[PDB]
Amino acid sequence: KVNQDGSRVLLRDVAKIELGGENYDIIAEFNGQPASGLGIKLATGANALD
């Protein structure tokens, strides 16, 4: 907005502009410690071993 006294209301003054994630639904830790990872799955037919 641009209030009557002509100041400025910008996001900073209403929204805490951070930088988090898409979801806060998956929380993972390795050995009780904070971590991420990827559940790499085997495509049909291909060799697990390869």
């Binding site: 988090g20 979801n23 806060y24 639904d25």
Partner: protein, 50 residues
């Protein structure tokens, strides 16, 4: 005027959970909000503020 009402009046909206996405310390109830959902009858349809 009729069309553009059977739209608004009969639709399916969104509304997050209660916790889920990042909550506050020590919260306890997470539930799911259920806002506007489609009419299901000639009754409910008969009544539309035009």
């Amino acid at each position: 005027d009729v069309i553009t009402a059977i739209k608004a009046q009969n639709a399916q909206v969104a509304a997050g959970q209660l916790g889920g996405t990042p909550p506050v310390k020590g919260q306890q109830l997470n539930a799911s909000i259920i806002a506007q959902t489609r009419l299901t009858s000639t009754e409910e349809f008969g009544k539309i503020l035009l």
